Design a binder for this molecule. Sequence first.
Ligand SMILES: CCCCCCCCO[C@@H]1O[C@H](CO)[C@@H](O)[C@H](O)[C@H]1O
Lengths: 209, 205
Amino acid sequence: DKALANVFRQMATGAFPPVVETFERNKTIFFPGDPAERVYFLLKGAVKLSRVYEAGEEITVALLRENSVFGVLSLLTGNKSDRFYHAVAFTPVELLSAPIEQVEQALKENPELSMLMLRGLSSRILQTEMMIETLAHRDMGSRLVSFLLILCRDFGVPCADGITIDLKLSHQAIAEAIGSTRVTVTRLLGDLREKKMISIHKKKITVHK
Amino acid sequence: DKALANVFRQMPVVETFERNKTIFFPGDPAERVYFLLKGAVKLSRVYEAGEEITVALLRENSVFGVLSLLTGNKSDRFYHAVAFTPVELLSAPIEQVEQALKENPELSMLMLRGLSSRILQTEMMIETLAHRDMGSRLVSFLLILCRDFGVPCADGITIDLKLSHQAIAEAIGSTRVTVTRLLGDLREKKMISIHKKKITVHKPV
Ligand SMILES: CCCCCCCCO[C@@H]1O[C@H](CO)[C@@H](O)[C@H](O)[C@H]1O
């Protein structure tokens, strides 16, 4: 729509437009250690962004929803070459991507684009802060509940009993987000279901509240 | 430094806050934007269910109090900003910032670096808070302080801030006594030493 076409207009630099890319569920968009080459704009689906820290642990930093920008921190920084993030297609994803150097060029004396970028960084901050609340819980049960509520907000569809998260969710993908094992998540969701707090239909979780 | 002045010249009150004093409260609308000149600011977020959790430690040259505007929460912040140590800062009414973001082309470009820095600081608190044991959380938090406020040492890195056990506990979500005993254990192991209420980390490595 008009918003998307605007992004094309603000990103034109006399070479390629932003490219459409699609990724299947659970496919990696970019790996830590890989050259940080492109900036991404999420059109459909959910992206799990994680960071590999200095001691080497990988931790989810954000569950990015449609309209988010990512892969762009390096450009806004000093040092640039090497990605320390892992981006994964949490669900099937469609996005736009452009070389970092194109973004850097397009930003040049372009208040409209830097304002779009500012809103993007601000959304990234808010989403990272949601993961803070999730991971601050020392018990896995509460992390799982907080994570489900992120998904309710990002992808939830109202219904009689509550809110249906509008994605087919694997237990392993959930475990990876919250730093648990697939086995634990299956146990916890079973506990939640037996307590009548959630129901599951065709792999879509409905949270009753 | 020169960059912070640059952000300001695009966009008035000088204020000081003593240690632990609140700069702004959650539930209050965003009234001003703040440029931090001296000291440390602890930003925390109040979440829907009512828990308050640290989201960033801000150091000199940070700009804060503007996020809420950029995200449509000008009418009621869910952030709490506190002088983690005694602070000095410059502030401006948010209406003037709003005006500048709409007139001055170069302004939002100059703010991208500040927001990027905020993301990186929030991600450090992610790594700290994801630790389920308080000992690891404390150590991670001490390392954040070493990066953000550390001064190179023959002994190692000295965190150049005078911090109370209670302020540390609040930041990492622990009790005062837990932090006291953990710092005690770290001193017994020679991993840190404390002189004139300043912590030196001997090998952050
Ligand atoms: C295509 C690869 C380069 C990415 C830079 C694009 C910046 C996108 O910016 C975004 O555009 C959306 C649509 O209007 C908005 O709704 C967002 O709030 C905004 O941050």
